[PDB]
């Protein structure tokens, strides 16, 4: 259904396949800059959406975004555990003073 | 001074709320208004940042 | 004075009374734990003072409840089928029943008369409170109205027990005439046009007291039916599934208790708030309460 | 007595059952409006209960006729 | 409850309505002829003096007299239905109240037009520490805004994103209550209003580049979320895709002025279908929308006479 | 020979039952409108009670026919 | 002695269904009247006559019952 | 034998009762619309009263049928 | 008349009462809409009156059948 | 005859009565929508009268069954 | 047939009457929505007539049951 | 050849058929009301509307089967 | 030889059934308004449950009449 | 047989009729909601049919009761 | 004996069926409001189920009355 | 034995039929709200199915009482 718009794009070109991560077929297409913008408009008319993440992951290069996302995924659990621990420690340390 | 004390009570209520604790009545702390504000502000700041 | 009495007249299951005693022991242990009772899906947060007042009210209810249950003679329902603690002339096993209450051929008119007497007494007390308060406030409208409603109710009960009741209407014909004359005289002295609708509403409020005896008989008949079915299906059907049959019957009895006893207790306080308050008014401007300086501590 | 006794009993039962039907029919919309007024404010619960108990006179007269039938029975 | 005893006074008030010639003859006046014709009108019964502000205040008083009573004089499921007819002014008053509480101007700053609840509740809501406490002070039983603001209130203390999400949840709970009623046409009219408001948010946010799914709402039947994204993009073909629905004449338009004009035209045409239901409640909704079209026509003719507008300057205002 | 006192009792019971049914049918909408007015205004509670008690004449006629049947009994 | 009680049964059915219809009319009648009273005290007698209009059915039923009791 | 008069009276009572029930069923919405209209203005009172009282014709026909049964009784 | 004419009159009265019931059931919403139209305008009185009087043939046919039963009696 | 005639008359009366009941049940909403359309426009009165007159086929069928029963009488 | 014939006729009458009752019960909302659609457009008058005639198959089945009863009469 | 059971069987079959038609019409009222509303909404989904309208006839078919069983057991 | 026990049992069954029907008719709108109030908040759930259980006195009186009938048996 | 067969068929007919009445009473609001959802989208026909066929178990149980009656017959 | 036992089961059926009728009557609007409350949030299912299960006490009492009838016969 | 088993079957069928009637009466509003929620969200299908199946306990009890009557039959 999107390959019809890809046939409307660069015909023996627009390298477009969907590899893996079967929760969603990551259809990657590549032709050009401006003709690819027109083809992205035609595919969104056929129904399509770009991987627009928030923050910097949908705002930086994909290798750098993958590195930052992997770093945040490896770091967030110990940080959240320490955050809950220091929060509970501050609560158990100051709740009586706050109550008085 | 009443608005200051009322804002102090509101900040203590929000501090207990962000701490998740509930307002239980107890014997109070006789302290100065700015002194109690100074005691409130550091724990409230650490709690808000956390 | 009365809500525990009508409540004990309502429920006469000594086993359910002991279940309430054990539940009060659990609540008393929660009170001795000095933790506020927190019920999440019930959203019931309770300080220990209200819980202790509830437990004291429960003990005061359970005392007269066990008293009237001994008067009805029913231990966890009709245990006299299995262990004949209650005594009838049909099969005397042990001590006799003051109210047998499985048979209505000798007990129902007495129970209805008891409920009617308690209701008329409470109605008399409420109208007397209304007239005494009208005298205390020196507003003769409310006091004369209570006097006229009381006289109309007395003449109504007299004419009812005369015509629709038994014979020998000579001792009460002048009584009904005097009640009608008191009603007409207070209508002239009041001129409020608080008509026979008001008198009939007061009469229905008086006559509604038999719902106590009704719900007591209903719960007793249900408990006796369930207990007889369980004892039969256990002992007479085999005498081997006594554990299984007794457990299923006790579980169904617990389900029936959880489905019935709340509203059964509720009907007494509903009758109390609907009669003792309403004859005495208790719906005038709601008052202003003591709001002293807090010092929340 | 004969067959007239069960017939009088059936008529008294018809009276009591239809009286309870009319009582619940009056009670339904009245209690709905009272529940709405209670959800408005906690102040008007007394008048709500007064209006709630005002309809039970039909059940009262039905039980009275039932006792009259049982005395005739 | 009784959808007929109110319907009799609704038919009486429907007898009190101005014809199209009352505005067609009003195409040529000089605000003194318009003042005399309004003096003949029942809405000029509150006619205080001369001037545009006196005319608008008299129009507001007449709208309160003839339209405000419909929120009263009813009780029950019919009350729960008819409450969700004059709800835009109430949500506007709540939005101005939230804007004033977050801004800091005086509580007598906004002028607080007439709605459904007591205005004393709105004055008492100027002083409240918690937003949930202000919601409980503003809590009526059948007020949909009270249930909406409380459910939306579990995010923060007072935010503007909270206000916009509260408007979204307000439209959503309005659609939920419209589905939750035994009314064959009120659900359809509310869903038409919901889809029109979705199209209005789309046209107002066309070219903004924001997230359309965060902007799009749920409750409609005339459009699609993919159609919503196509309207978010610069594609008038999606507006041309509206065929067979009530959005018939809304085609080939990109300017939001005539777009919402035709949207209001389609809404009023759907409101004209309310005369088919003489037993339910939609006839009263049609009477309310008719008074609303009369009110827009009245303030329009008032501006035209006070500023001396050309007949061509307002020719696109009385076409339907 | 019987079967006539029971027939009269069945008729009186049906009369009282359908009369209380009509009384409740009136009293439902009556008390609904009255509770709505009382929640609207506590000033008109007496007129609301008057409009509520106005429907009792059907119960009056039904109890009269019941007493007439019992006197025939 | 067979038709002595069936006439009373029919008169009772008449009175009961007449009261049923009278209350069915009186529900909407008194509902609109209480709504008008809640609007203002200025419609007391008109709503009173509107409420009182339904009692002719009860009057005719009482007439038929009195004719039946005269036959009884 | 004598099973004609009681059956005839039973049928006549059923006729009169169901006729009054249908008359009240009409008169409910009739007087409802008339009262809501007269509450709007005191300008169409007699036309509303005519439209309300028009429903008594079925009651008149049922009364004629019951009188015919009484003449047959 | 025995069991024949009594049950015949019983069925005739049943037809008459249920016919008046259906006529009133139609006339309720019919006259309700007509009164709403009269409250809308005092101009369509004739067509509304015609639509109101249209639901009388049920009562007419029921009375004709009752008279046919009376001629059979 | 005898018990046949009264029971046959009762069945014919039941047919006619519940048939007129259903006919009026349709005719209520029929005339309601028709008077609403008449208030909308007088130019649909023919279709309104057609939709009104459409319901009488059940009354015709019940009258046919009643005439067949009277022929059996 | 002096006893079974009247009961068979009573059953056929009950069948025809309740069938017409259900037919009119369907036809009420059917004709209401259809007259609303006809006021919306004359372009769906045929669909309105089809949905109106959709209810008559039950009356046809009841008439066939009555014809089978008359064949058993 | 029952003298009273034959009329009783016809009475029961007639009550069955009549109340079955009553329930079928009670369903078909709201069914056809919503169907005509959607038909006025669109002349596109008329087939599913007719399918839903015909869906209530199974109770009538069961009642006709019961009446045929009663007539066979005459 | 006597079916008066069966007649009394039939009357008691009709009594209990109509009493349960009226109790359910009250409890429908009562629980509807109460579940709406519970959906509003958890504030007045106790008074709502009180008003819900308040309708049980009719079914209680019906059970009392049934038990009186059983004791008469 | 005697009279037990005819009364057995009468009870089976009453069972089947009341069961079909209740099933259609369910199916009314069921199909109303289902046609509303069909008007919402065509992507719900696989659940609307299940919601429609959910009330058929009552008709199945009534048919099983009638089949048990016929087997006892 | 062959009529006394016969009416007893008929009375038990008249008890149980109308009891379940009232049970479903109470269950309808209560379960509708509970489904609306669960559709509002996945947090109010408990009180909804409590109010839904609250109506079955009358059905249990009627089943006990039916057990009393089966003990009687 | 005479008309005993037929009366017992009549009572059992009446119980089952009015039980299915009440079950469908609950299931009407139940499935209406459930189909509205299902069109709102497919994620609420389980709680809707549980609320829909909640009305079948009355049908189970009626089938059990019918089997009890069949054992008595």
Short mmCIF file of N, CA and C in Angstrom, two decimals, chain E residues 103-157:
data_model
loop_
_atom_site.label_atom_id
_atom_site.label_comp_id
_atom_site.label_asym_id
_atom_site.label_seq_id
_atom_site.Cartn_x
_atom_site.Cartn_y
_atom_site.Cartn_z
N UNK E 103 -4.16 34.25 36.43
CA UNK E 103 -3.58 35.52 36.00
C UNK E 103 -3.33 36.44 37.18
N UNK E 104 -4.38 36.77 37.93
CA UNK E 104 -4.25 37.62 39.09
C UNK E 104 -5.05 38.90 39.06
N UNK E 105 -5.95 39.10 38.09
CA UNK E 105 -6.76 40.30 38.06
C UNK E 105 -7.89 40.21 39.08
N UNK E 106 -8.73 41.23 39.17
CA UNK E 106 -9.80 41.23 40.17
C UNK E 106 -10.88 40.21 39.84
N UNK E 107 -11.56 39.76 40.89
CA UNK E 107 -12.66 38.82 40.73
C UNK E 107 -13.85 39.45 40.02
N UNK E 108 -13.98 40.78 40.07
CA UNK E 108 -14.94 41.50 39.26
C UNK E 108 -14.36 41.92 37.91
N UNK E 109 -13.33 41.23 37.43
CA UNK E 109 -12.68 41.63 36.19
C UNK E 109 -13.51 41.23 34.97
N UNK E 110 -13.72 39.93 34.77
CA UNK E 110 -14.65 39.49 33.74
C UNK E 110 -16.08 39.82 34.14
N UNK E 111 -16.96 39.88 33.15
CA UNK E 111 -18.31 40.36 33.39
C UNK E 111 -19.30 39.25 33.75
N UNK E 112 -18.92 37.98 33.56
CA UNK E 112 -19.59 36.80 34.13
C UNK E 112 -21.05 36.68 33.67
N UNK E 113 -21.20 36.34 32.38
CA UNK E 113 -22.51 36.23 31.74
C UNK E 113 -23.39 35.15 32.39
N UNK E 114 -24.69 35.20 32.13
CA UNK E 114 -25.61 34.29 32.82
C UNK E 114 -25.53 32.88 32.27
N UNK E 115 -25.45 31.92 33.18
CA UNK E 115 -25.38 30.52 32.82
C UNK E 115 -26.43 29.67 33.49
N UNK E 116 -26.00 28.64 34.22
CA UNK E 116 -26.90 27.68 34.83
C UNK E 116 -26.95 27.73 36.34
N UNK E 117 -25.80 27.80 37.01
CA UNK E 117 -25.76 27.80 38.46
C UNK E 117 -25.88 29.23 38.98
N UNK E 118 -25.80 29.36 40.30
CA UNK E 118 -25.87 30.68 40.91
C UNK E 118 -24.57 31.44 40.68
N UNK E 119 -24.69 32.73 40.40
CA UNK E 119 -23.51 33.58 40.26
C UNK E 119 -22.81 33.80 41.58
N UNK E 120 -23.53 33.65 42.70
CA UNK E 120 -22.91 33.72 44.01
C UNK E 120 -21.92 32.58 44.23
N UNK E 121 -22.17 31.43 43.61
CA UNK E 121 -21.20 30.35 43.63
C UNK E 121 -19.94 30.75 42.87
N UNK E 122 -20.11 31.46 41.76
CA UNK E 122 -18.95 31.93 41.00
C UNK E 122 -18.19 33.00 41.77
N UNK E 123 -18.89 33.81 42.56
CA UNK E 123 -18.21 34.80 43.39
C UNK E 123 -17.48 34.13 44.55
N UNK E 124 -18.10 33.10 45.14
CA UNK E 124 -17.47 32.36 46.22
C UNK E 124 -16.30 31.53 45.74
N UNK E 125 -16.29 31.15 44.47
CA UNK E 125 -15.19 30.38 43.91
C UNK E 125 -13.96 31.22 43.60
N UNK E 126 -14.05 32.54 43.76
CA UNK E 126 -12.88 33.39 43.59
C UNK E 126 -11.87 33.17 44.71
N UNK E 127 -12.33 32.74 45.88
CA UNK E 127 -11.47 32.45 47.01
C UNK E 127 -11.57 30.96 47.33
N UNK E 128 -10.57 30.20 46.90
CA UNK E 128 -10.49 28.77 47.21
C UNK E 128 -9.03 28.35 47.09
N UNK E 129 -8.53 27.63 48.09
CA UNK E 129 -7.13 27.24 48.08
C UNK E 129 -6.89 26.08 47.12
N UNK E 130 -7.70 25.03 47.21
CA UNK E 130 -7.46 23.92 46.31
C UNK E 130 -8.29 24.06 45.05
N UNK E 131 -7.76 23.61 43.91
CA UNK E 131 -8.59 23.55 42.70
C UNK E 131 -9.70 22.53 42.82
N UNK E 132 -9.45 21.42 43.52
CA UNK E 132 -10.52 20.47 43.81
C UNK E 132 -11.53 21.05 44.79
N UNK E 133 -11.07 21.90 45.71
CA UNK E 133 -12.00 22.59 46.59
C UNK E 133 -12.87 23.58 45.84
N UNK E 134 -12.29 24.27 44.85
CA UNK E 134 -13.08 25.15 44.00
C UNK E 134 -14.05 24.37 43.14
N UNK E 135 -13.65 23.17 42.71
CA UNK E 135 -14.55 22.31 41.94
C UNK E 135 -15.70 21.82 42.81
N UNK E 136 -15.42 21.48 44.06
CA UNK E 136 -16.47 21.05 44.98
C UNK E 136 -17.38 22.21 45.35
N UNK E 137 -16.84 23.43 45.41
CA UNK E 137 -17.69 24.60 45.62
C UNK E 137 -18.53 24.86 44.39
N UNK E 138 -18.02 24.52 43.21
CA UNK E 138 -18.76 24.63 41.97
C UNK E 138 -19.47 23.34 41.61
N UNK E 139 -19.52 22.36 42.51
CA UNK E 139 -20.09 21.06 42.19
C UNK E 139 -21.60 21.11 42.30
N UNK E 140 -22.29 21.03 41.17
CA UNK E 140 -23.71 20.69 41.15
C UNK E 140 -23.78 19.20 40.90
N UNK E 141 -24.92 18.56 41.14
CA UNK E 141 -25.01 17.11 40.91
C UNK E 141 -24.96 16.75 39.44
N UNK E 142 -25.77 17.41 38.63
CA UNK E 142 -25.86 17.08 37.22
C UNK E 142 -25.05 18.00 36.34
N UNK E 143 -24.18 18.81 36.93
CA UNK E 143 -23.31 19.64 36.12
C UNK E 143 -22.22 18.78 35.50
N UNK E 144 -22.13 18.72 34.17
CA UNK E 144 -21.05 17.93 33.56
C UNK E 144 -19.69 18.55 33.77
N UNK E 145 -19.63 19.87 33.91
CA UNK E 145 -18.37 20.55 34.15
C UNK E 145 -17.78 20.19 35.50
N UNK E 146 -18.63 19.93 36.49
CA UNK E 146 -18.15 19.55 37.81
C UNK E 146 -17.47 18.19 37.79
N UNK E 147 -18.04 17.24 37.06
CA UNK E 147 -17.41 15.94 36.89
C UNK E 147 -16.20 16.00 35.98
N UNK E 148 -16.19 16.93 35.03
CA UNK E 148 -15.07 17.02 34.10
C UNK E 148 -13.84 17.65 34.75
N UNK E 149 -14.04 18.75 35.48
CA UNK E 149 -12.91 19.45 36.08
C UNK E 149 -12.30 18.66 37.22
N UNK E 150 -13.11 17.86 37.91
CA UNK E 150 -12.57 17.03 38.98
C UNK E 150 -11.72 15.90 38.43
N UNK E 151 -12.15 15.29 37.33
CA UNK E 151 -11.37 14.22 36.72
C UNK E 151 -10.11 14.77 36.07
N UNK E 152 -10.21 15.94 35.44
CA UNK E 152 -9.03 16.59 34.88
C UNK E 152 -8.16 17.23 35.94
N UNK E 153 -8.64 17.33 37.18
CA UNK E 153 -7.92 18.02 38.23
C UNK E 153 -6.81 17.20 38.84
N UNK E 154 -6.67 15.93 38.47
CA UNK E 154 -5.59 15.11 39.03
C UNK E 154 -4.34 15.17 38.17
N UNK E 155 -3.92 16.38 37.80
CA UNK E 155 -2.66 16.59 37.11
C UNK E 155 -1.73 17.53 37.85
N UNK E 156 -2.20 18.73 38.19
CA UNK E 156 -1.37 19.75 38.82
C UNK E 156 -2.28 20.65 39.65
N UNK E 157 -1.78 21.82 40.03
CA UNK E 157 -2.57 22.78 40.80
C UNK E 157 -3.45 23.63 39.89
#
